[PDB]
Amino acid sequence: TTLLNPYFGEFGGMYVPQILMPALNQLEEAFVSAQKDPEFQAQFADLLKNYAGRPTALTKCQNITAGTRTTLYLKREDLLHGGAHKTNQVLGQALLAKRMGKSEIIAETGAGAHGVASALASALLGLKCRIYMGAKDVERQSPNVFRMRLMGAEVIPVHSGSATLKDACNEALRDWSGSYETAHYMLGTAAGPHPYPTIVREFQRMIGEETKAQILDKEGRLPDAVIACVGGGSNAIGMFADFINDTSVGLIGVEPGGHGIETGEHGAPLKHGRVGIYFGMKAPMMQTADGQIEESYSISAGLDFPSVGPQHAYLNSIGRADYVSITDDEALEAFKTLCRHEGIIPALESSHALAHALKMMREQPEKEQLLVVNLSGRGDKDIFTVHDILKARG
Amino acid sequence: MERYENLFAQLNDRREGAFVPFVTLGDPGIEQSLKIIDTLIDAGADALELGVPFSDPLADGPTIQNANLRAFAAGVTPAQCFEMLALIREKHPTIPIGLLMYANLVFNNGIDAFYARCEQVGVDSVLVADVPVEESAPFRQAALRHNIAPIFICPPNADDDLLRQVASYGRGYTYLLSRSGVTGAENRGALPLHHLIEKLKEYHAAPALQGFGISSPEQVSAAVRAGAAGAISGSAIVKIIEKNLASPKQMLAELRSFVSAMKAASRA
Numbered sequence: 090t091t092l093l094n095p096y097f098g099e100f101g102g103m104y105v106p107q108i109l110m111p112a113l114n115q116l117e118e119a120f121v122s123a124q125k126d127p128e129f130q131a132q133f134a135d136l137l138k139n140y141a142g143r144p145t146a147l148t149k150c151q152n153i154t155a156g157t158r159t160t161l162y163l164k165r166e167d168l169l170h171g172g173a174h175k176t177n178q179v180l181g182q183a184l185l186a187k188r189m190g191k192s193e194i195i196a197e198t199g200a201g202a203h204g205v206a207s208a209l210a211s212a213l214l215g216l217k218c219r220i221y222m223g224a225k226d227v228e229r230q231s232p233n234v235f236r237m238r239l240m241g242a243e244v245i246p247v248h249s250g251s252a253t254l255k256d257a258c259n260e261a262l263r264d265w266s267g268s269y270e271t272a273h274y275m276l277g278t279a280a281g282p283h284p285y286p287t288i289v290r291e292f293q294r295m296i297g298e299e300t301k302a303q304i305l306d307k308e309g310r311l312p313d314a315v316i317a318c319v320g321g322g323s324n325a326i327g328m329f330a331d332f333i334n335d336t337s338v339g340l341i342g343v344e345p346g347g348h349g350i351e352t353g354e355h356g357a358p359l360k361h362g363r364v365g366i367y368f369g370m371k372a373p374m375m376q377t378a379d380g381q382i383e384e385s386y387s388i389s390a391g392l393d394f395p396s397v398g399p400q401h402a403y404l405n406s407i408g409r410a411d412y413v414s415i416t417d418d419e420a421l422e423a424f425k426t427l428c429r430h431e432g433i434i435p436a437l438e439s440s441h442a443l444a445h446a447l448k449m450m451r452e453q454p455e456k457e458q459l460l461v462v463n464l465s466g467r468g469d470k471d472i473f474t475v476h477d478i479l480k481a482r483g
Numbered sequence: 484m485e486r487y488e489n490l491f492a493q494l495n496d497r498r499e500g501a502f503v504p505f506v507t508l509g510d511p512g513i514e515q516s517l518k519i520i521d522t523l524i525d526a527g528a529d530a531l532e533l534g535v536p537f538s539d540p541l542a543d544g545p546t547i548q549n550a551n552l553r554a555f556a557a558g559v560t561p562a563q564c565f566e567m568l569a570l571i572r573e574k575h576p577t578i579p580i581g582l583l584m585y586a587n588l589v590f591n592n593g594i595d596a597f598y599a600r601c602e603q604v605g606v607d608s609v610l611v612a613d614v615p616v617e618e619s620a621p622f623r624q625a626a627l628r629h630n631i632a633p634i635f636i637c638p639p640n641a642d643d644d645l646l647r648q649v650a651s652y653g654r655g656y657t658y659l660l661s662r663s664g665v666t667g668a669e670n671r672g673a674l675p676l677h678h679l680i681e682k683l684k685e686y687h688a689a690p691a692l693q694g695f696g697i698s699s700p701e702q703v704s705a706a707v708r709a710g711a712a713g714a715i716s717g718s719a720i721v722k723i724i725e726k727n728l729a730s731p732k733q734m735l736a737e738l739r740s741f742v743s744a745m746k747a748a749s750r751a
């Protein structure tokens with residue numbers, strides 16, 4: 090039994106070994122309690138404001154829409170401490186860990202963004218942090234690995250399975266299965282077993298709350314659509330949550346199309362995968378015909394989650410949200426365009442959301458539309474990746 | 484069929500416990516795996532627990548992670564595993580055969596169709612490692628419709644409500660976890676399980692088999708002495724495979740010796 094519904098329609102659930110069920114129930118109870126606790130809320134708000142720098146700007150981008158009937162704002166999660174939206178929910182999960190009397194943090198990371206966010210929160214709040222990372226990711230994310238270590242976190246390479254994110258996800262759960270009495274598992278997206286999809290949403294929803302206030306202040310009305318990239322679903326659900334009951338507002342999630350959906354080399358399970366059960370949840374996922382889990386491909390390492398949060402699959406099923414894909418090449422063009430016309434270097438993850446907005450504008454330039462793109466992170470980390478392509482391309 | 488019921492009745496008549504090895508199907512290849520399994524039975528295994536190779540075995544420690552990887556290196560697929568299972572049953576009519584599955588492999592092509600395939604090849608039970616009792620309904624229902632025992636896990640700290648659920652819903656045997664954590668012979672369970680064993684019997688649960696970290700004869704004898712119907716050993720068996728990959732003949736000899744010793748410890 091649980092306090093909250095573990096499902097979003099058919100999607101979600103608690104598909105963990107029996108030994109972990111008390112951990113999930115304890116976390117759910119602590120979360121429900123925290124949400125009613127004005128002191129917890131004030132501590133969270135204090136960290137978000139004075140440490141992370143919220144509220145984040147909403148930037149009107151006039152140059153890129155010139156000559157069209159599109160008005161485009163960017164919600165500037167790139168300006169949050171750490172340079173990505175992940176900071177928001179790590180701070181809240183760290184406070185939940187404390188609330189439960191836990192002194193240790195376990196986290197998974199692929200590209201390293203969640204590992205660094207976890208390590209920084211742990212440093213600030215006096216938790217001992219250990220981070221699992223696939224051996225292949227370790228080798229290729231030296232900068233992030235070094236940051237995690239500078240911040241006092243232990244980084245543990247994972248050599249099992251495919252030595253990437255899903256394997257680090259497994260190793261974190263294996264550790265937690267034996268350590269849950271003292272350690273909190275700080276899951277990095279709006280996915281996995283209940284209560285994680287719900288907790289991550291609630292600890293990211295200030296993105297959309299702020300966006301709504303900012304757009305009412307500047308435009309006097311709600312947006313026609315809000316657009317966000319979808320790796321596991323945290324930044325998107327963070328932007329979408331406060332608009333779900335505003336039926337006029339379009340919710341558009343953008344999965345990575347990689348080399349092209351037709352190539353099979355993509356990370357778009359919501360629209361192009363098959364429902365499965367893995368990482369604690371029933372959700373669309375990248376898998377072989379006989380049910381082995383596969384990897385997500387994208388130029389952006391941060392969109393590498395081989396599944397998607399169950400609330401997104403639900404919002405799609407009922408037609409509340411629409412999901413599309415953007416290829417590597419489209420993302421790269423959007424990256425270059427924003428740099429040159431707006432003086433902002435976006436994360437390649439966020440560039441997928443911008444690319445789709447640019448398509449909405451370009452395809453129908455005399456359509457009047459007020460759009461918000463969630464700029465989930467900054468793209469300093471991506472300049473070498475973009476360097477190497479632009480050079481090999483000529 | 485009623486293979487577990489018949490085994491436990493026969494073992495009761497001999498005042499013996501069950502010794503149940505685990506191996507991964509197709510580790511280190513199909514032909515050698517079939518030989519391994521025949522050896523386990525000939526050496527005294529009372530029942531089998533058999534894993535289908537899965538990409539993400541999140542309840543398994545390194546020994547069994549590596550067994551899964553060896554099977555994949557040999558190209559082993561679930562379809563090939565089901566072929567193996569049919570042949571094992573064709574050779575051995577009465578030994579209970581249980582599978583260790585992960586949820587996605589059961590759900591993949593439909594839950595009902597998975598259990599129907601199990602029935603066709605003569606499997607007796609299925610344990611789905613990542614489905615807790617809370618999520619078990621469509622699995623246990625499909626199992627029972629196809630004459631398959633759904634195996635439930637009883638953790639060492641199970642409360643009364645969970646014990647009642649496991650007792651009601653399970654069939655074949657009740658899996659009594661030695662400890663928290665994941666499979667592996669390097670960590671031995673150090674919690675007394677006699678109170679759980681007594682409460683399960685009170686609730687007419689399927690007979691208990693203790694598993695996780697069982698790697699020596701004294702542990703088998705201890706499981707029986709505490710009231711369990713027997714014990715399961717996985718990593719310790721798989722370690723012998725891993726140790727002896729270079730010598731298939733010595734691998735079988737060492738497996739025989741080990742299983743013989745472990746089974747002997749079950750008689751008293």
Ligand SMILES: O=P(O)(O)OCCNS(=O)(=O)c1ccc(OC(F)(F)F)cc1
Binds near residue numbers: 533660715716
């Ligand atoms: O001897 P060990 O320590 O290797 O343990 C052998 C375990 N093999 S098994 O198939 O019984 C088995 C039983 C339950 C498992 O996970 C679960 F409890 F979550 F369901 C995993 C494997």
Ligand SMILES: *Cc1c(COP(=O)(O)O)cnc(C)c1O
Binds near residue numbers: 322325436439466
């Ligand atoms: C991690 C990350 C993402 C993808 O994760 P979600 O959970 O889908 O938000 C997207 N953008 C940036 C900048 C990230 O760091």
Ligand SMILES: [Cl-]
């Ligand atoms: Cl308000």
Ligand SMILES: [Cl-]
Binds near residue numbers: 456457
């Ligand atoms: Cl218009």
Ligand SMILES: [Cl-]
Binds near residue numbers: 651652653654687689
């Ligand atoms: Cl029963």
Ligand SMILES: [Cs+]
Binds near residue numbers: 096098099
């Ligand atoms: Cs349901």
Ligand SMILES: [Cs+]
Binds near residue numbers: 156157160
């Ligand atoms: Cs404009």
Ligand SMILES: [Cs+]
Binds near residue numbers: 385
């Ligand atoms: Cs994805």
